[PDB]
mmCIF file of C-alpha atoms in Angstrom:
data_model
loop_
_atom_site.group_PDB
_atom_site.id
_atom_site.type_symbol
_atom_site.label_atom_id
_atom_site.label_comp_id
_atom_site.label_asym_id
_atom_site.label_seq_id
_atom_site.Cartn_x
_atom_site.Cartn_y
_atom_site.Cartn_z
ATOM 1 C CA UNK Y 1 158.268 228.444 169.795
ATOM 2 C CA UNK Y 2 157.577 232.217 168.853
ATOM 3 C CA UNK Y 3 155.974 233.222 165.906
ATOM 4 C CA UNK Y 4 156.428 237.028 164.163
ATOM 5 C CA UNK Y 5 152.897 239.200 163.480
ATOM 6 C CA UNK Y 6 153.790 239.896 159.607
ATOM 7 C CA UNK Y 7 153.446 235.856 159.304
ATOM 8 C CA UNK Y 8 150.048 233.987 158.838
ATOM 9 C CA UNK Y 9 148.765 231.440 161.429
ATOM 10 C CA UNK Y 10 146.534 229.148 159.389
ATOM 11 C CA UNK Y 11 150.057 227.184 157.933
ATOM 12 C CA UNK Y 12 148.282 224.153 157.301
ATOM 13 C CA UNK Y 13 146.842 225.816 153.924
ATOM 14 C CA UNK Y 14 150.500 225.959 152.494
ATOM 15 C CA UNK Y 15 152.966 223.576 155.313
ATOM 16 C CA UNK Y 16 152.387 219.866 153.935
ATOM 17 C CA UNK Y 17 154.414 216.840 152.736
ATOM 18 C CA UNK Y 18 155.101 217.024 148.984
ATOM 19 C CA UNK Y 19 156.226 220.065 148.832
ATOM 20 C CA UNK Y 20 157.749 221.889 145.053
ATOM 21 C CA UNK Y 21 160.932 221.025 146.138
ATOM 22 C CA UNK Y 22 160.466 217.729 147.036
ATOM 23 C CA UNK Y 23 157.989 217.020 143.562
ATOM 24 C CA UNK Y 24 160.827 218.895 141.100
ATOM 25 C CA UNK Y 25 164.083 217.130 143.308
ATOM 26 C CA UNK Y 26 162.294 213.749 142.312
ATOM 27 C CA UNK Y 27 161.434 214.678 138.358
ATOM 28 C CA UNK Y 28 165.055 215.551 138.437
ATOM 29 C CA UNK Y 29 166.062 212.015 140.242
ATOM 30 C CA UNK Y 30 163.303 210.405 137.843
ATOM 31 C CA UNK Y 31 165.378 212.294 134.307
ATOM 32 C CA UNK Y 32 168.841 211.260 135.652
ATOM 33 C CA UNK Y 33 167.408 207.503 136.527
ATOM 34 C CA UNK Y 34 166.201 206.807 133.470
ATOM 35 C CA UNK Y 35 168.929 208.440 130.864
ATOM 36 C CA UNK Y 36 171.648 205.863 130.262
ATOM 37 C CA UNK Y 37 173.553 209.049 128.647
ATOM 38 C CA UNK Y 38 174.613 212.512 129.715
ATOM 39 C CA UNK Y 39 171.931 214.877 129.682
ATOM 40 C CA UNK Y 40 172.450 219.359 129.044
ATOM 41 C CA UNK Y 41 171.089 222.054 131.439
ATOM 42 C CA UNK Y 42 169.005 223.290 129.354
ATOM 43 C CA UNK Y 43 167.356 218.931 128.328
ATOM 44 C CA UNK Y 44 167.368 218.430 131.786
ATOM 45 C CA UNK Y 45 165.330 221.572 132.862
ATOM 46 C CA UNK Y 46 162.931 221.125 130.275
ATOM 47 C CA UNK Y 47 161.799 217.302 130.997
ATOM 48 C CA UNK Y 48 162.129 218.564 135.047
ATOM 49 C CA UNK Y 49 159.411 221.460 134.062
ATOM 50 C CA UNK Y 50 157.441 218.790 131.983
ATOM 51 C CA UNK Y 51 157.435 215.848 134.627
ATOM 52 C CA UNK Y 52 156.868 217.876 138.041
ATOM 53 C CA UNK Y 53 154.828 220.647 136.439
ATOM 54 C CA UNK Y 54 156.554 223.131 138.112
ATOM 55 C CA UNK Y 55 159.635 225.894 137.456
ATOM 56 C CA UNK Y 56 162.663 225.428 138.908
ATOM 57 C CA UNK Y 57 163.575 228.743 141.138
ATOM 58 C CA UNK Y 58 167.063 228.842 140.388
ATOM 59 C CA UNK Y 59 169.187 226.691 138.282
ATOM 60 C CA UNK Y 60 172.418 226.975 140.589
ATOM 61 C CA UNK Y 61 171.339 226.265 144.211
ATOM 62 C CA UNK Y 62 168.701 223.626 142.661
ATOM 63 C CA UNK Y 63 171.999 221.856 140.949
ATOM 64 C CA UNK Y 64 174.098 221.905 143.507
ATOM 65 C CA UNK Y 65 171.000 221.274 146.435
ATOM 66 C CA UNK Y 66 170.261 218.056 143.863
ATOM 67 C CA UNK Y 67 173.906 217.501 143.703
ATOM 68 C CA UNK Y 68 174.307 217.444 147.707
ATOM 69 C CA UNK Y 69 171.342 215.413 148.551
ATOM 70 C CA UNK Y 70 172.000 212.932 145.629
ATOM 71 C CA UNK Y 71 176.159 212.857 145.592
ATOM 72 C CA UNK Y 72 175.771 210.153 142.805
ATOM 73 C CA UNK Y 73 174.319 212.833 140.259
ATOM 74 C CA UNK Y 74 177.523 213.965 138.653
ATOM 75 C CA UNK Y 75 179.129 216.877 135.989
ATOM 76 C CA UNK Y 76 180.869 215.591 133.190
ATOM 77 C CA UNK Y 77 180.755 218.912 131.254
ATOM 78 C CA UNK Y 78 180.418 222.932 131.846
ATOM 79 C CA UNK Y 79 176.285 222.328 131.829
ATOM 80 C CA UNK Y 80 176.220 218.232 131.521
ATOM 81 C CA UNK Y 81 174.998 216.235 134.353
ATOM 82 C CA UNK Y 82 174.800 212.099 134.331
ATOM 83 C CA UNK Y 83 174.187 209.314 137.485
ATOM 84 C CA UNK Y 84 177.056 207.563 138.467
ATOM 85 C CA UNK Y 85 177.049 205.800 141.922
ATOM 86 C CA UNK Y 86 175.182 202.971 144.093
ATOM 87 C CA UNK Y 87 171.921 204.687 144.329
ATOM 88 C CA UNK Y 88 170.573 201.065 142.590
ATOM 89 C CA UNK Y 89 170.206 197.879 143.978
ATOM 90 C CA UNK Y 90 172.417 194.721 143.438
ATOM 91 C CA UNK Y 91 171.519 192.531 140.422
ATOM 92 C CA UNK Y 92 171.204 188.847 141.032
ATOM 93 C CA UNK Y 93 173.580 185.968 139.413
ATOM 94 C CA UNK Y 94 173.428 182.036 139.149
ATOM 95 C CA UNK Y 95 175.801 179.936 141.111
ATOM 96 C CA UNK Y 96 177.426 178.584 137.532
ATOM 97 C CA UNK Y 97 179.508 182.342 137.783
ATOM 98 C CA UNK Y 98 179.961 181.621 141.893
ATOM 99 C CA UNK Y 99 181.576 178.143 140.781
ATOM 100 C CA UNK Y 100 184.527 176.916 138.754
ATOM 101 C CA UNK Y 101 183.678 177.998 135.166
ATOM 102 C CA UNK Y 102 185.125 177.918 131.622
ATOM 103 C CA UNK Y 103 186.053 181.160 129.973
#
């Protein structure tokens, strides 16, 4: 493919795997995982900056980008995210609950 003359050619300095997006998308996956609880905007920017080490760009297309790759991260308030959905494995269970059983 073409390639414009206002654009650098030594891409390898910058174009690698683990990328800002990629490090603050899983800080963000990280903060929902392990709140039990809702979590604010503003809480859930702050331990996203903390974790990754790096600003978010924008708050609304990295929200809704989080929301689209991850469709388990949900809004239960104006500014209030939780997780809600089979992102997790199965637990286990003894047989005792898969046979006849007292109540």
């Amino acid at each position: 493919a073409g390639i414009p003359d206002g654009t650098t050619r030594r891409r390898r300095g910058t174009a690698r795997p683990g990328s800002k997006a990629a490090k603050l998308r899983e800080a963000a996956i990280k903060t929902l995982k392990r709140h039990n609880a809702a979590i604010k905007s503003s809480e859930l920017q702050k331990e996203i900056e903390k974790e990754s080490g790096l600003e978010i760009p924008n708050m609304t297309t990295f929200m809704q980008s989080l929301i689209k790759m991850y469709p388990e991260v949900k809004k239960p308030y104006r500014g209030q995210y939780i997780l809600e959905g089979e992102i997790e494995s199965a637990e286990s269970a003894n047989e005792l609950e898969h046979h006849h059983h007292h109540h």
